[PDB]
Amino acid sequence: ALFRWLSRKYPKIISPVIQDEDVDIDGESRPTRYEDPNPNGELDNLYLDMNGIVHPCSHVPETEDEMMLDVFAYTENVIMMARPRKVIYIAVDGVAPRAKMNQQRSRRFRSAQDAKDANEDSNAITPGTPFMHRLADSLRYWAAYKLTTDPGWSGIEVIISDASVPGEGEHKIMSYVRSLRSSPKHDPNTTHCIYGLAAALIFLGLATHEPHFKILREDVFAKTPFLWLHLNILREYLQIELNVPGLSFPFDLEKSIDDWVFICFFCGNDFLPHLPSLDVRDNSITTLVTIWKQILPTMKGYLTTDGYLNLPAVERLLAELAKKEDYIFRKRYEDEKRSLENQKRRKNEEIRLWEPGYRKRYYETKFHTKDPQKVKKIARNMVQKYIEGVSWVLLYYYQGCPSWNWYYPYHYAPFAADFVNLSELKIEFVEGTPFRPYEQLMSVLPAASSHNLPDVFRSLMSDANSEIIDFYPEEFPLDMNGKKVIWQAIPLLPFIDENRLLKAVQSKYDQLTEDEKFRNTNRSEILVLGRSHSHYPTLVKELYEEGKDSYEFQVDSSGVSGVAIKLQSFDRSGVLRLPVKQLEGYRHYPDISNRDFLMVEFKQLPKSHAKSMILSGLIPHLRRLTQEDKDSILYGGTNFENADFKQYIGPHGKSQYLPRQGGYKAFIQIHSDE
Amino acid sequence: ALFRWLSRKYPKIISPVIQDEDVDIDGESRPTRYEDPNPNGELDNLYLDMNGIVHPCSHPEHKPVPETEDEMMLDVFAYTENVIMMARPRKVIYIAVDGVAPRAKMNQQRSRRFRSAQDAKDANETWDSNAITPGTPFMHRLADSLRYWAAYKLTTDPGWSGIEVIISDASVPGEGEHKIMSYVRSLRSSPKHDPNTTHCIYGLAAALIFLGLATHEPHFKILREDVFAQDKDKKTPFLWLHLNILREYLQIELNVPGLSFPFDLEKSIDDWVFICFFCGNDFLPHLPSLDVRDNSITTLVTIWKQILPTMKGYLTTDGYLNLPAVERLLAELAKKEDYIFRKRYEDEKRSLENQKRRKKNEEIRLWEPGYRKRYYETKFHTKDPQKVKKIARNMVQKYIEGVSWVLLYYYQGCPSWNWYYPYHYAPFAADFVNLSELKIEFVEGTPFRPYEQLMSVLPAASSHNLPDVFRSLMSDANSEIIDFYPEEFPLDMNGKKVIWQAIPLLPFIDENRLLKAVQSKYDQLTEDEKFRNTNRSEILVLGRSHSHYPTLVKELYEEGKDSYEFQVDSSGVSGVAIKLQSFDRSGVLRLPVKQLEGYRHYPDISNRDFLMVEFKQLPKSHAKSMILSGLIPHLRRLTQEDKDSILYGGTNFYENADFKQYIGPHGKSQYLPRQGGYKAFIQIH
Amino acid sequence: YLPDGDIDNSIDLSVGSKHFLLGDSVELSKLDPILLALKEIEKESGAKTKDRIITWRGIMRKLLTLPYDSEEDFVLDVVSFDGQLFIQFNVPYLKSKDVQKQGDTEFHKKLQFSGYKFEKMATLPKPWPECTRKEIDSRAKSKCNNIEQYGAIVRTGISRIKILIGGAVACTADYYDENDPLSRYIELKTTRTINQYKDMIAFEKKLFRTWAQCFLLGIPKIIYGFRDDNCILRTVEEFSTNDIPLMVKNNPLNEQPKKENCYMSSINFYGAVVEWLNESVKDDQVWK
């Protein structure tokens, strides 16, 4: 949805991918090699969101062995498509925070209803399944094979973050990218690319405040085509768009981006319900942008600073949003009916939002009560939780996970008029620890997926006398309150009580096996290095000869910092065997000994309070946006490809600053022409 | 064209006129008496522009084509009677006829006059349309026609007892709606003026909307027939156009938050009106980047909104410009010049694309960059950069004078009778810099005699109406001013759509030599011609039964007083009255129009039942712009619905009740209850 | 640390001049810190080092600039103690210069304060990762001075004589390189904007002086903050000390070509001066 609006408003941030063909070396039918220059522009790091590959949908291979080879072939293509030169980060979702459990729980329970009507496995992707255990080792073999069987992979690392590592896909990427900035030696002009399908990536890409960033995905509106998504171009758009005049404080686009990213979460995210007066398809983002620009000159400070809210400022933001509820609601009701007679002339009811006083009907019906004190108590509780959610999410995208146990205790969002006197509210978080995968499996898998769950825990999920059977209803109410039937249906389900859930699950771990117990413990990411790589002599000399338990790192040839720990399970003389049985129709993968690569436990630098400002010594690229492009942004209001992709995307030029006014070099060019 | 935008942007301004005939009063559908209550709300004054009635060419859809002047006179009488009947004034009726227009005006319609002559020549290879001009003998017949109708209406109709009629014939200098504007300002300077006077102008030009807001009299409206339903014998519908409601809209629309000075909707409207004059007016060519069809008024308004919080004062104040303020306004517009020109290029070719599926050399290419240089030598045929810089800067100076001249002309009367725009085109908005350096001054001068104005706007093909003596000076090939009258002239298409909106390039009349030749022929004119070539004063006609009637006779006819300051009266008219030497107390007035069958023959009437006095207004005063004391606002027509739809509507361009109760000054308090008022506290609980 | 946003924010350089501080010229010009460093290094070594000349960077910079920038006069004191040379200014000449500074107008005080303020803006007390917003934003409020500063002592050598001098370091580019500190050192100075040929000429003279400064210390990179006549920063330009002679020689706008390169001549003059100093005094003598 948001992708279509981004394409419409910003055309230049999308470009096709030059997949080329077999012949690239000046004709004569020369097959491509990994060392050939990339027509798409050189790239340093590439981060993979493995969900987009492990769950391609497109409803099909029936056995794991059929698709693992397809996964390897598909991933080989995209890596060849972009050709990272320094690092490859592979991220597989771990246990997500409690906040996303409820959103994930609703998605799975809806799929249970989908199966029932189909009666008139795609659920094994969740962490903790035996398929995850098989998949995790599958990646390790693929990484080793590519490094040892390719001349072009000499100086490229592979970092594996499987389901064992806690945290979700993008969060793993976000934490690592920030950790690179914590090292003072970090090279500012490091170029990044990330592959994924989720629409949050555009926002999360701007959170790093690294201009040399880009996002890779296939063409939704289309060999499968792929589309580049250059964020540095997008920064040029936002810098021009979000520079309002008449300011009492100096302009700072770095803080503006944080504000702009912030408001793009009220319109919609995956942790809190959208506001009743807001909808992305209704261009609600432009509504907030116009409001935010209008009110900003009055205030003295920005809405947020490094992921921390300014409660008096944000309370002002949505204050006049309350002034636009009635117009918005009447617009929907007028337009909803008006479309009905359009087809008729040619060849919900409980609240009646268009009519005034909707606030009373909305809370009364949605809560099955009409006591004003009860409504007053509930409505005030609604705001305090919601502001915490916004506070929690904004921290979650700037400072890692701030709370592993927080969740939203209601199914609906309060009206924008309700948020008053927010400064009196007190916000506090407790980080806690992420749940074990088996606990996460029970919290999100529906009643129709006991097979994925361990057989011991199957009883506690479907037993009529199970102490958590109330958490597992076969049939659930569907509060429609939406378009027509199911598009935004709310699966009204009781929120899982941790104390009831945690007490029961911990009483069943004893009768499990060591393979399951090992599969129910958190781990740390691993790193594999090539034999010809520069660090190969260094790490072995220290982690295998000097007997060092651990060895610190800094910015190096790879560009990866952190802490290295020797992998006990790793054997110097061992040989890796492809866990998937070698099928037919694909390239045979020979076993490889450990004499050509090293596997070491990996860690990141200690967490630090990140600052959302551009680093020093940075070099900016050129600019697509010309005067005509700029003019269509300021005065355009509302409205309805391969040149320079080698010397333009990267950090063009060698000067950090720009030649302006009285600069000596700037004097030369202006007086050179004249 | 503007009226379409007003209709689509402000919906509730327009309301149909309740055309009631043979009302069933007490079960009897007898004809409505003039004294019967008006279903359109009671009205006090009424100002009539004779241009909107005496123009058969303006409405050629039907077949009027009156062969004899008598037909026109009687049709005018019937139409005026109908319009007054549906208007129903109670205090004053003002009748206005165009006079000798200011020098800055006839240069416009002189191009318009030649277009008829240009088309007539081509069509050749019905009455004379050009005969509707001051100085013709037709008005001398028309001037007497009005007075007889005024006398007859007063002396017979019982309801017209308290009415007073003021007639300003073509002899009185001044443009039509300018006279109404000047007269209303004269009523403003009287301290005894009633703040709650309800006015109404019957006009056809769209400029009346702005001229209505200039007065700052909230109780005001304009009477106009349905333009959009007349095209798509039977009684023509008319549209009430309540200005007081438009005051409600602009108050919400122009209330930009966060200002360094207190908000003043009264001051804002002058800025809003002044903006609506760049987009187009009869005196100055429109800006190249400004088109009313392109909603340029909204373009300026948005620019005016952002430029305002920084700017410490309003653009205009009581008809006077603030040059530093306006300069900033055009600077923001100067940035949009390139962008605006672009759409007019693509939308031009996009329109060209659509028709394909359904079935002085120009070449500037404004959409291409560098058009600013290419524009001038294309139009001025001079490649010297030095001349262009001097010419463009000088030609900008005239334009600023014009805007200054125009704005004064609608607020403080005519500032100069000799200024005119010496260029055929408007400069680019980017050229408006260093405005404060420019010096602005005017000379009042004196208006022309009607004969001088006749030849200066009439072409060489209509010398028949003009006196025969002067025809030699304008028709002979050896005339010293024959160059002023070319049979054929170059037409500048200027890249328009159709030829009828081109630019008729013509030379500018040399005033100094033109008058000198003309003054030589005064001595050969007849006495009747000389009298018709003399400016005069207005005429006030009062009925015998009127309350103020005995006072006039007591002094102007018994005490022998030469003048008498009328001041405010029962009718609200104020000024100076002078006895008319021509008028005879014991005489009888006869209709100078031959009677026509079936047109309600009007008997002659003696002078014993009415009075005619030469009328003058109060001395000119520097009128300010703010509402008067003691004013009672009308009941508000908007309840929080259009309030939202105008704040956030953005683009809203996609038969109701009587609404008469929303016209008069509802209530009696000058102020309104609010919050901590004692009456309000009682009212709330 | 200095992103482009601050450059676009039009930072003032005249604010705080009324709180400006100035130290004691005589106290600061003393060779005492270098003597402490020599005492320490001899303590670890246990024997007198092979260094022959001990002095400050400013004197040698003046000596390099002498053949082509001789707009000032000076008096220097030379003491050959223990067979090693020691060069410092003349205390009576220090008093004379202080008197001249007293006679100097507020123009010089404002300019030097603006220079110190610009140094304050583009510097951070801690490396960028471990700073906080409070440290970054409150830079303009901290009062500047000319007492606390960081200096470095370098060992070099011309011809056949080892030279051991010291000098102040403005700041480091990104952090401290314990293996090659000179590589990451950065020097900062201010200048007026450039609009006419006289501006290029004066700027080139300043470039020559600063090149002497850095190249004597071996500083690779030099940065100027271009301020207007109103003490408002306008632009920032970067240079490398190796590129300076080439940039001056290869100037496309050099309307007056330089038939002779002044850099080599200055270095030759400095070498001759060093030989003269090493030869003229034998031991336990004081000269001027």
Side-chain angles (χ1 to χ4, degrees), chain A residues 323 327 330 628 631 635-636, chain B residues 335 339 342 641 644 648-649:
Chain A
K323 300 177 185 171
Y327 179 47
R330 276 178 283 155
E628 310 87 357
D631 293 345
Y635 317 107
Chain B
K335 296 179 167 58
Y339 178 42
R342 255 197 290 275
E641 301 330 290
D644 300 338
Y648 323 126

Side-chain angles (χ1 to χ4, degrees), chain A residues 8-71:
Chain A
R8 274 185 160 81
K9 190 148 191 179
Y10 315 107
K12 307 216 166 188
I13 76 156
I14 310 194
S15 44
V17 172
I18 309 174
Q19 310 183 19
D20 205 352
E21 57 262 4
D22 172 78
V23 55
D24 48 342
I25 310 290
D26 59 271
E28 76 257 7
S29 179
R30 184 51 186 81
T32 80
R33 304 167 274 165
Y34 193 77
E35 303 88 328
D36 310 332
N38 200 333
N40 297 295
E42 308 310 311
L43 176 73
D44 280 325
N45 299 335
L46 186 135
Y47 319 100
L48 282 158
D49 189 358
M50 201 56 28
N51 309 336
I53 300 105
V54 65
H55 195 30
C57 170
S58 80
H59 326 292
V60 170
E62 61 273 28
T63 62
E64 311 168 353
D65 303 337
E66 285 162 339
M67 51 165 208
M68 294 283 217
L69 321 170
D70 300 358
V71 165

Side-chain angles (χ1 to χ4, degrees), chain A residues 157-424:
Chain A
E157 280 71 8
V158 170
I159 308 173
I160 297 299
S161 189
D162 63 358
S164 68
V165 182
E168 81 176 307
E170 293 82 3
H171 185 257
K172 274 151 175 172
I173 306 300
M174 291 322 314
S175 174
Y176 164 72
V177 168
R178 275 197 318 269
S179 69
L180 290 194
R181 285 150 74 82
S182 66
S183 172
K185 305 196 189 174
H186 169 79
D187 171 35
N189 307 283
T190 291
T191 64
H192 314 261
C193 167
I194 179 161
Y195 172 86
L197 274 299
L201 277 296
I202 306 86
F203 304 147
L204 277 296
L206 288 169
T208 65
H209 293 281
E210 300 276 349
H212 296 319
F213 208 101
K214 74 174 65 176
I215 297 169
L216 174 73
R217 68 183 295 165
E218 51 88 18
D219 197 314
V220 54
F221 51 88
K223 45 174 69 73
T224 312
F226 279 81
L227 289 189
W228 283 127
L229 204 57
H230 310 258
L231 302 191
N232 52 351
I233 300 310
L234 170 63
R235 289 180 77 86
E236 311 179 18
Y237 272 133
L238 290 182
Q239 155 172 12
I240 298 299
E241 170 166 329
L242 294 201
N243 190 32
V244 298
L247 265 295
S248 72
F249 39 93
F251 179 54
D252 188 0
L253 76 163
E254 286 321 300
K255 306 188 78 62
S256 306
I257 295 314
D258 291 331
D259 273 18
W260 186 89
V261 162
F262 163 79
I263 76 179
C264 294
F265 290 157
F266 267 106
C267 69
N269 67 75
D270 307 339
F271 313 92
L272 312 161
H274 73 108
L275 290 178
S277 59
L278 289 183
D279 203 344
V280 183
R281 44 151 282 157
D282 306 358
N283 199 9
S284 52
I285 301 188
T286 316
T287 295
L288 274 297
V289 166
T290 309
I291 280 183
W292 172 86
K293 295 168 70 167
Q294 188 274 331
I295 190 167
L296 188 152
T298 77
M299 283 74 74
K300 54 182 291 213
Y302 287 100
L303 282 71
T304 180
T305 53
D306 309 335
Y308 292 115
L309 287 170
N310 298 349
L311 275 298
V314 56
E315 187 164 350
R316 293 214 40 217
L317 179 44
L318 54 86
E320 69 275 16
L321 191 53
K323 300 177 185 171
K324 205 185 283 190
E325 319 279 341
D326 311 334
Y327 179 47
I328 284 302
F329 287 124
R330 276 178 283 155
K331 269 289 295 185
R332 282 185 204 160
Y333 177 63
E334 174 265 1
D335 275 314
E336 277 188 355
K337 297 180 312 307
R338 195 259 315 154
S339 48
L340 260 68
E341 292 85 4
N342 277 309
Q343 45 91 15
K344 279 174 175 65
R345 82 192 68 144
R346 77 182 44 115
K347 190 71 71 174
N348 297 120
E349 316 91 4
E350 312 152 341
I351 318 289
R352 61 199 187 277
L353 277 296
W354 49 101
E355 302 181 19
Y358 42 71
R359 293 199 27 193
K360 283 309 180 184
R361 277 90 67 190
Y362 188 93
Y363 292 145
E364 278 165 322
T365 303
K366 296 275 206 272
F367 288 74
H368 310 287
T369 178
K370 50 187 59 60
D371 179 74
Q373 279 69 240
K374 200 189 311 168
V375 166
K376 194 256 286 182
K377 287 182 294 279
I378 277 174
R380 194 60 199 174
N381 189 179
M382 213 48 50
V383 164
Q384 183 182 7
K385 286 310 175 186
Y386 198 80
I387 297 300
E388 275 184 8
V390 159
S391 307
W392 182 95
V393 171
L394 183 63
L395 284 190
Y396 180 78
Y397 283 167
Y398 280 86
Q399 315 303 131
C401 182
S403 169
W404 285 94
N405 53 4
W406 183 93
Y407 74 108
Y408 202 45
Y410 301 99
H411 299 84
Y412 303 96
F415 290 85
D418 310 324
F419 313 101
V420 295
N421 294 334
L422 319 176
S423 51
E424 296 88 318

Side-chain angles (χ1 to χ4, degrees), chain C residues 116-132:
Chain C
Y116 288 122
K117 180 63 155 176
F118 162 80
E119 190 277 331
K120 174 53 51 63
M121 294 298 102
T123 46
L124 261 61
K126 303 183 192 180
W128 184 96
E130 47 268 56
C131 291
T132 56

